[PDB]
Design a protein around this ligand. Structure first.
Ligand SMILES: NC[C@@H]1O[C@H](O[C@H]2[C@@H](O)[C@H](O[C@@H]3[C@@H](O)[C@H](N)C[C@H](N)[C@H]3O[C@H]3O[C@H](CO)[C@@H](O)[C@H](O)[C@H]3N)O[C@@H]2CO)[C@H](N)[C@@H](O)[C@@H]1O
Ligand SMILES: [K+]
Ligand SMILES: [Mg+2]
Ligand SMILES: [Mg+2]
Ligand SMILES: [Mg+2]
Ligand SMILES: [Mg+2]
Ligand SMILES: [Mg+2]
Ligand SMILES: [Mg+2]
Ligand SMILES: [Mg+2]
Lengths: 200, 88, 49, 129, 143
RNA sequence: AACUUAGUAUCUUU
RNA sequence: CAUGGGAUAACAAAGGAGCAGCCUCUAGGCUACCGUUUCGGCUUUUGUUGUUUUUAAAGGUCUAUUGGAGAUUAUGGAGCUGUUUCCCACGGUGUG
RNA sequence: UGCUGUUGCUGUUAAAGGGUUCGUAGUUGAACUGUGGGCUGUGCAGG
């Protein structure tokens, strides 16, 4: 088969989709002729590629699911790899997300005690959000419970990263709602140590 | 529409006491320290036209010395006092 | 007697894990060689074109 | 040491309401405390409240209106059948026309009126009016 | 220390940061951090001292934040964990030193009072460690 | 409409 | 005593290298299985019951061998030797 | 008769905190695994 098809799982090599094929060629082309990615890509492959429209905006989001065992590999070169993939795919935002299993919360206390804590929905959803914003880290988290009974989560980021993530925040919130079916709102703190929220 | 109402829809309350505009506390008939303050509205010119805004402050707040702070908060809320000076 | 039973189970476990590690190393090398064949045939196509 | 987080939270709110504050900070937080606040909020006795995450037992900031007179936990939990509701309203509520006894039931945390409507008993958590 | 045995109400303690990510300027690999932890342990240093030296001279604020494992966990995985838990070891050492002083100073009743508190602390600590099976059953501190 | 940050020295001193 | 509900709690366990264990397609080669201080039991069709045996199947060790995963990079680690995209109105950010 | 107080007592001065500390039974004991979306209609929902 095509040499660039080993950047996908062997399941999808037979009949790759258009987006999976395009990502595979870009990863294979980046496997060479790139200093930082040549050291890590050869051991790396992706699971699937999914497109999200992100309404009230242009520049749809390409979500690239990869196996969780490559988390450290992706983390080391996430910034460079995201930029190169976005360069190869104009009019798109690239989101590298690790495929994670979720263990349904048992109704039995003895089964609850044996649940792996990284398989819980809360841990998985936080890690998915951390994947989404990776260069920036969560500096604070709050839940506003309105008088109507709704509870909305606000995630604060460091204001020093505003020029690198503010444009993508709307895309991040929608794709997070797609993957996790939970809502997240974003804010910026110029002094996270003192809980100082940036006004503008 | 305020107060105790009958099954026949008749208000059975003797009267409806005032509520403090700072703490939403009922002002009792024996307070004698609760005050009512009227602030005149001002038109485009510096002249009061015909109208006032009324504030009710419970007597306990005045005894604690927090009536001035409460009146500051209420007037800022109602748009009477400016919370800060303008930009230079 | 409990000591021999416990030791035997531990020995079986170490043998099982060692066998699995060898098998995974075998599949890794076979796939790596196959990847070499794919790249070599890619070079052959480049020579044609 | 602190034995009941819920009792600490409810007492903090009651003291702040008694002192006439507009905001009150709660520490530490818990799921039971949040559910108690939501029942209070659904009936209009408190305004907005915010849960602050500290990677520990979190904190809560509660916006207080002037409607809450008193809230308090009931210790021990004192399990309550469907026939014991009128007994508890008589004992710890100012009137049969307002105020709520909050219980924990297998259907969730809810006030006594909703618990009677769903025909379920439980364990008394607290009260507010 | 503070509250148990002596009605002290001190609050001094560390305040761990909210953001757990290692700083970007820390270029050291996790496998090397594990190596230093084991190397420091082989020199006889206790886990508390190992963390402080890494914090003071290597810019490693939290071993767990860098490697995902606590220092004692790393020592246990490498077979370098102390035979007796660190806090129990230090309490036993203090009790032995106090008893050595009391052998000559028989009228130091304040030290005798402090010794009672230390030995009581040892026995409560031993009860916990035997329950969680970090101490062999029939472990007993002998005066 | 509940602010994005709101100084200051004196005396002795192999 | 029976049964529905699982929020609040209780009992028990565990103290996390003190740890389970990746499945799957095809070939094959050996080995019957259990009893065992004891010389003993041991499926079905062979018309039936006893006796002696086979072809086997079904497990088990091994040689492989196909295709899929993996919750943590083996194209790795350590030891060893040598030398354009995006935002904005053109500017800014990111990766080269 | 809330003068036996589980509901529901009192203990600075009226009756009543043990001189201090350790401490076994006993009583009590922090947080967390979490409560879903979509569509239609409807309701001063609201900014
Ligand atoms: N220090 C060694 C320990 O001895 C233990 O064995 C000891 C215990 O089984 C038992 O000791 C008991 C003890 O159970 C019980 N809780 C208290 C009792 N005082 C002890 O008894 C012992 O001590 C007293 C005087 O101190 C002696 O008169 C007596 O002869 C002795 N058996 O008798 C043995 C003493 O020789 C265990 N082997 C183990 O805990 C450990 O090896
Ligand atoms: K005890
Ligand atoms: Mg003490
Ligand atoms: Mg083991
Ligand atoms: Mg009586
Ligand atoms: Mg009576
Ligand atoms: Mg009396
Ligand atoms: Mg007296
Ligand atoms: Mg608890």
């Amino acid at each position: 088969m095509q040499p660039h098809l080993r950047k996908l799982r062997k399941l999808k090599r037979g009949k790759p989709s258009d987006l999976e094929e395009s990502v595979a060629k870009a990863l294979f082309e980046l496997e060479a002729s790139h200093k930082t990615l040549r050291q890590e890509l050869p051991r790396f492959h992706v699971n699937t590629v999914r497109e999200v429209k992100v309404p009230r905006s242009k520049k749809t989001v390409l979500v690239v699911f990869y196996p969780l065992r490559f988390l450290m590999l992706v983390r080391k070169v996430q910034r460079a790899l995201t930029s190169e993939l976005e360069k190869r795919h104009p009019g798109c935002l690239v989101m590298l997300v690790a495929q994670r299993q979720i263990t349904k919360r048992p109704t039995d206390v003895y089964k609850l005690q044996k649940v792996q804590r990284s398989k819980t929905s809360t841990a998985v959803f936080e890690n998915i959000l951390n994947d989404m914003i990776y260069p920036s880290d969560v500096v604070g988290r709050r839940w506003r419970c309105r008088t109507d009974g709704s509870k909305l989560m606000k995630v604060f980021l460091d204001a020093r990263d505003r020029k690198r993530i503010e444009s993508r925040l709307r895309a991040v919130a929608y794709v997070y709602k797609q993957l996790t079916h939970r809502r997240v709102s974003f804010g910026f703190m110029w002094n996270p140590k003192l809980q100082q929220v940036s006004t503008r | 529409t305020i107060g105790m109402f009958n099954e026949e829809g008749e208000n059975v309350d003797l009267y409806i006491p005032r509520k403090c505009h700072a703490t939403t506390t009922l002002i009792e008939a024996h307070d004698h320290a609760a005050v009512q303050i009227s602030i005149a509205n001002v038109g485009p010119n510096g002249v009061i036209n015909g109208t006032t805004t009324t504030l009710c402050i419970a007597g306990y707040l005045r005894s604690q010395g927090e009536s001035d702070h409460a009146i500051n908060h209420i007037t800022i809320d109602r748009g009477i006092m400016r919370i800060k000076t303008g930009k230079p | 007697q409990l000591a021999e039973q416990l030791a035997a189970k531990h020995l079986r476990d170490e043998q099982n894990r060692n066998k699995a590690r060898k098998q995974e190393l075998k599949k890794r090398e076979k796939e790596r060689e196959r990847a070499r064949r794919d790249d070599a045939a890619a070079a052959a196509q480049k020579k044609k074109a | 040491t602190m034995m009941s987080v819920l009792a600490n939270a409810l007492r903090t709110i009651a003291s702040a309401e008694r002192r006439g504050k507009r905001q009150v900070l709660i520490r530490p937080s818990s799921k039971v405390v949040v559910k108690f606040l939501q029942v209070m909020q659904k009936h209009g006795y408190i305004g907005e409240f915010e849960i602050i995450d500290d990677h520990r037992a979190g904190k809560i900031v509660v916006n207080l209106n002037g409607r809450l007179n008193k809230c308090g936990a009931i210790c021990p939990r004192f399990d309550c059948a469907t026939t014991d509701y009128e007994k508890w309203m008589k004992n710890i509520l100012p009137s049969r026309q307002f105020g709520f006894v909050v219980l924990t039931t297998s259907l969730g945390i809810m006030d006594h009126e909703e618990a009677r409507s769903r025909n379920t008993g439980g364990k008394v958590l607290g009260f507010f009016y | 220390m503070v509250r148990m045995h002596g009605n002290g109400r001190g609050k001094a303690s560390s305040a761990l940061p909210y953001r757990r990510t290692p700083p970007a300027w820390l270029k050291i690999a996790s496998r090397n951090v594990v190596k230093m932890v084991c190397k420091s342990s082989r020199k006889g240093m206790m886990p508390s001292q190992i963390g402080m030296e890494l914090r003071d001279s290597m810019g490693i604020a939290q071993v767990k934040n860098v490697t995902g494992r606590k220092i004692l966990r790393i020592l246990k995985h490498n077979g370098l964990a102390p035979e007796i838990p660190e806090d129990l070891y230090f309490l036993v050492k203090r009790a032995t030193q106090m008893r050595k002083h009391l052998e000559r100073h028989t009228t130091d009743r304040d030290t005798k009072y402090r010794l009672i508190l230390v030995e009581s602390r040892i026995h409560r600590l031993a009860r916990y460690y035997k329950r969680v099976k970090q101490l062999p059953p029939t472990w007993k501190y002998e005066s």
